[PDB]
Structures are given as C-alpha cells and as structure tokens.
Write an enzyme that holds these catalytic residues in place. Structure first.
Site, PDB file in Angstrom:
ATOM      1  N   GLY A  91      53.222  -9.615 -26.802  1.00  0.00           N
ATOM      2  CA  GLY A  91      54.660  -9.591 -26.577  1.00  0.00           C
ATOM      3  C   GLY A  91      55.167  -8.454 -25.710  1.00  0.00           C
ATOM      4  O   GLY A  91      54.394  -7.604 -25.261  1.00  0.00           O
TER       5      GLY A  91
ATOM      6  N   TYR B 115      57.047  -6.021 -26.659  1.00  0.00           N
ATOM      7  CA  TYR B 115      57.187  -4.780 -27.420  1.00  0.00           C
ATOM      8  C   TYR B 115      55.874  -4.362 -28.075  1.00  0.00           C
ATOM      9  O   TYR B 115      55.601  -3.168 -28.259  1.00  0.00           O
ATOM     10  CB  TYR B 115      58.276  -4.924 -28.489  1.00  0.00           C
TER      11      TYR B 115
ATOM     12  N   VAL C 179      51.976  -6.310 -30.022  1.00  0.00           N
ATOM     13  CA  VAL C 179      51.023  -7.393 -30.104  1.00  0.00           C
ATOM     14  C   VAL C 179      51.475  -8.360 -31.182  1.00  0.00           C
ATOM     15  O   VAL C 179      52.059  -7.951 -32.182  1.00  0.00           O
ATOM     16  CB  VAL C 179      49.629  -6.861 -30.454  1.00  0.00           C
ATOM     17  N   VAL C 180      51.217  -9.645 -30.961  1.00  0.00           N
ATOM     18  CA  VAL C 180      51.591 -10.667 -31.928  1.00  0.00           C
ATOM     19  C   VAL C 180      50.339 -11.343 -32.456  1.00  0.00           C
ATOM     20  O   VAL C 180      49.484 -11.785 -31.688  1.00  0.00           O
ATOM     21  CB  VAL C 180      52.502 -11.736 -31.313  1.00  0.00           C
TER      22      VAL C 180
ATOM     23  N   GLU D 179      58.477 -16.827 -38.874  1.00  0.00           N
ATOM     24  CA  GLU D 179      57.949 -18.126 -39.240  1.00  0.00           C
ATOM     25  C   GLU D 179      57.028 -18.483 -38.056  1.00  0.00           C
ATOM     26  O   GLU D 179      57.330 -18.174 -36.894  1.00  0.00           O
ATOM     27  CB  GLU D 179      59.091 -19.151 -39.374  1.00  0.00           C
TER      28      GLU D 179
ATOM     29  N   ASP E  42      65.972 -12.227 -22.671  1.00  0.00           N
ATOM     30  CA  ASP E  42      64.698 -12.444 -22.027  1.00  0.00           C
ATOM     31  C   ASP E  42      64.113 -13.825 -22.306  1.00  0.00           C
ATOM     32  O   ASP E  42      62.962 -13.974 -22.691  1.00  0.00           O
ATOM     33  CB  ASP E  42      63.711 -11.348 -22.412  1.00  0.00           C
TER      34      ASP E  42
ATOM     35  N   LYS F 272      62.271 -17.184 -21.620  1.00  0.00           N
ATOM     36  CA  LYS F 272      61.243 -17.665 -20.708  1.00  0.00           C
ATOM     37  C   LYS F 272      60.499 -18.670 -21.558  1.00  0.00           C
ATOM     38  O   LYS F 272      60.615 -18.640 -22.801  1.00  0.00           O
ATOM     39  CB  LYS F 272      60.327 -16.538 -20.230  1.00  0.00           C
ATOM     40  N   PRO F 273      59.779 -19.596 -20.913  1.00  0.00           N
ATOM     41  CA  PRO F 273      59.002 -20.652 -21.570  1.00  0.00           C
ATOM     42  C   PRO F 273      58.109 -20.116 -22.680  1.00  0.00           C
ATOM     43  O   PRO F 273      58.025 -20.716 -23.752  1.00  0.00           O
ATOM     44  CB  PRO F 273      58.205 -21.262 -20.417  1.00  0.00           C
TER      45      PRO F 273
HETATM   46  C1  LIG Z   1      53.199 -20.036 -29.359  1.00  0.00           C
HETATM   47  C2  LIG Z   1      52.226 -19.924 -30.444  1.00  0.00           C
HETATM   48  C3  LIG Z   1      52.156 -18.712 -31.325  1.00  0.00           C
HETATM   49  N1  LIG Z   1      53.080 -18.839 -32.447  1.00  0.00           N
HETATM   50  C4  LIG Z   1      54.162 -18.029 -32.540  1.00  0.00           C
HETATM   51  N2  LIG Z   1      55.032 -18.161 -33.547  1.00  0.00           N
HETATM   52  C5  LIG Z   1      56.039 -17.261 -33.453  1.00  0.00           C
HETATM   53  N3  LIG Z   1      57.016 -17.238 -34.370  1.00  0.00           N
HETATM   54  C6  LIG Z   1      55.956 -16.412 -32.341  1.00  0.00           C
HETATM   55  C7  LIG Z   1      56.877 -15.416 -32.008  1.00  0.00           C
HETATM   56  O1  LIG Z   1      57.951 -15.200 -32.797  1.00  0.00           O
HETATM   57  C8  LIG Z   1      56.788 -14.535 -30.792  1.00  0.00           C
HETATM   58  C9  LIG Z   1      56.525 -15.105 -29.506  1.00  0.00           C
HETATM   59  C10 LIG Z   1      56.440 -14.292 -28.336  1.00  0.00           C
HETATM   60  C11 LIG Z   1      56.627 -12.901 -28.472  1.00  0.00           C
HETATM   61  N4  LIG Z   1      56.889 -12.356 -29.722  1.00  0.00           N
HETATM   62  C12 LIG Z   1      56.973 -13.127 -30.875  1.00  0.00           C
HETATM   63  S1  LIG Z   1      54.537 -16.780 -31.417  1.00  0.00           S
END
Ligand SMILES: C=CCNc1nc(N)c(C(=O)c2cccnc2)s1
Length: 294
Positions: A13, A15, A17-18, A77, A123, A125-126
């Site tokens: 992300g 900010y 890492v996700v 979620e 911000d 974006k796709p």
């Molecule tokens: C697109 C598949 C991954 N599943 C995700 N599920 C959620 N809820 C995601 C996010 O809330 C997120 C997305 C981009 C940057 N930061 C956070 S990502």
C-alpha cells in the site's frame, strides 16, 4: 503479528504493507495493513478513529485500528480481487457495459456518502477498488493525506501512480475538494470502457500534459483562476481540446455526457457524486454478477 497468521502479502500500500491474515481466535479472514515509525501522530489516530464509523456497503469496512510498537495496524474486511486485476483479466473481451455501469453507480454511491460526511478519498485508482463475487465494488485505502500525509512513495521504493490525479492537485492546489474524487473516478470509468488508461503520465508534468493534450490546455474561460494556480506556467503549451468522441469509443452518448461532466477542469463545474447518480446514463442500471476467477 502475534494475533494473526499472515496468510500472504496482498500488496505494498501507499502507507505500508498489506497482508491477508486470519484472526487466530475468531477465524475471520481480514486484510491487515501495517502503517509506517517513531511515535506516530495522534491527530491521525483520530482521523482514523473517524473512518471506523464511516460504514457503507460500497466502502471497505475498517474493523479495527491498533497503535502499538511504533506500528499502526488497520484491520479491514477482506475482498478477493481489485479492479486493476479484474480489468487486466477482462482485457481481451472487456467488462460488459452493464457491469461497468453497475460499478460506476456503486462507486458514486460510496463517494456521495463519503462526501456527505465530509470525507475525501484522495487517491482512487483501480488497485484501491475492491470487488466480490456478489457484484459489489468498494472503496478501499482512503488516502488520509490530511491525517498522516502523502509520502514520496508508500514507505519504500515504489513509484506512485499519477494517472488518476485531478488537474488542480497537479497545479499545486493546497486544498482538495470532493471534486478530486470525481475526476479520479471519471478516469477509471474511461479505462473500464476503453481497456486502456486515459491519462498514463509517468511524471507530474507528463501527467498534466497528457490531460492538456486530450482535454485542451485550460484557460480562464473554462477554468476561472487557473492561470493563478501555484504551479501554473504561462509557458505551458497550448493544446486544442480533442473531439470527445475520439476519447472513449464506443461509449454511448449518455456515458460520454456523464464522463465529460466528471472531467470538467474547473472543480466547481465538475459534477458531484449525488448529481452523477441522477444522470440519464443510470436509467437502466442493474447489478450483474462478475465472472471472478479467484
Ligand atoms: C485485492 C485483493 C486483496 N484484498 C484486500 N482486501 C482489502 N480490504 C484490501 C485493502 O483494504 C487495501 C487495498 C489497497 C491498499 N491498502 C488496503 S486489499
């Protein structure tokens, strides 16, 4: 994280890492974002503690916020796919118009809600638009440039995408309005329709000039006050506005009309999310099921 079993990293992300993770206790599967350091601002945790109440069907639910060990964790979620991946997966055939329309309508509902509660995404974006098997699409990764700030990258070596940035931001406006989100969504709408990014700039000036080359260099006529903006240069090239029918073929006139209003240069002329929902383009909106391969 001691309380989660990082199933896998689902992104880097803007900010931090996700990760996709499972609550070792509740068993719920979530998206865990680890925010970037040396104490962390409080005005932020409030701005965040505010987003937790911003619940809407087209807004990714923020479940928990946790400030610990110079680390800030946001628990969301989990959704299985983002619109960037879905668009790439649909590039040979294109997303069917009824689905494009459903997604656009839902995102506008989400933005109308955010905006009526004085929250800006900033911000879109796709990659930040998440979809599920039931046909829903939701806003994720709200910017928070007013709660933490907009870093050079995201946290470490990562080029920030400028393709969806409103012209006023590129021209140095200090205060963003809800209009910046409408602009980004219009760019996304165009991209879903044509299967190609509308303004793929690779630098701030290239982004600005790609917009000017397509919509024409803005002037005081179409955008009062533009020549007085912080980064405006009298030396900018003067490009004529290109015929709009050449921009998103073969989108119908209802779609093109709505898009033109989402892409007006003047933030004050740009259509609001609320008004866009009433546009004739949505007279026959429905909610189709996407074909998702997970
Ligand atoms: C697109 C598949 C991954 N599943 C995700 N599920 C959620 N809820 C995601 C996010 O809330 C997120 C997305 C981009 C940057 N930061 C956070 S990502």
């Amino acid at each position: 994280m001691e309380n989660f079993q990082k199933v896998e990293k689902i992104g880097e992300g803007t900010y931090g890492v996700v990760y996709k993770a499972r609550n070792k206790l509740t068993g719920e599967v979530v998206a865990l974002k680890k925010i970037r350091t040396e104490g962390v601002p409080s005005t932020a945790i409030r701005e965040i503690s505010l987003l937790k109440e911003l619940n809407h069907p087209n807004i990714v639910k923020l479940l928990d916020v946790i400030h610990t060990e110079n680390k800030l964790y946001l628990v969301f979620e989990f959704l299985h796919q983002d619109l960037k991946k879905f668009m790439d997966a649909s590039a040979l055939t294109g997303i069917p118009l009824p689905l494009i329309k459903s997604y656009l309508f839902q995102l506008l509902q989400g933005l109308a809600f955010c905006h009526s509660h004085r929250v800006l995404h900033r911000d879109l974006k796709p990659q930040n638009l998440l979809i599920n098997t039931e046909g829903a699409i939701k806003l994720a990764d709200f910017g928070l440039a007013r709660a933490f700030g907009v870093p050079v990258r995201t946290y470490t070596h990562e080029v920030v995408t400028l393709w969806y940035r409103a012209p006023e931001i590129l021209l140095g406006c200090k205060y963003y309005s809800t209009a910046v989100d409408i602009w980004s969504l219009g760019c996304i709408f165009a991209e879903m329709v044509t299967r190609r990014a509308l303004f793929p700039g690779d630098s701030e000036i290239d982004q600005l000039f790609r917009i000017f080359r397509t919509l024409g260099t803005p002037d005081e006529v179409v955008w009062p006050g533009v020549t007085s903006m912080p980064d405006y240069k009298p030396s900018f090239p003067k490009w004529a506005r290109q015929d709009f029918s050449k921009v998103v073929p073969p989108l119908d006139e209802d779609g093109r009309s709505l898009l033109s209003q989402m892409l007006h240069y003047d933030p004050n002329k740009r259509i609001s999310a609320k008004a866009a929902l009433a546009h004739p383009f949505f007279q026959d909106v429905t909610k189709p099921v996407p074909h998702l391969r997970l």
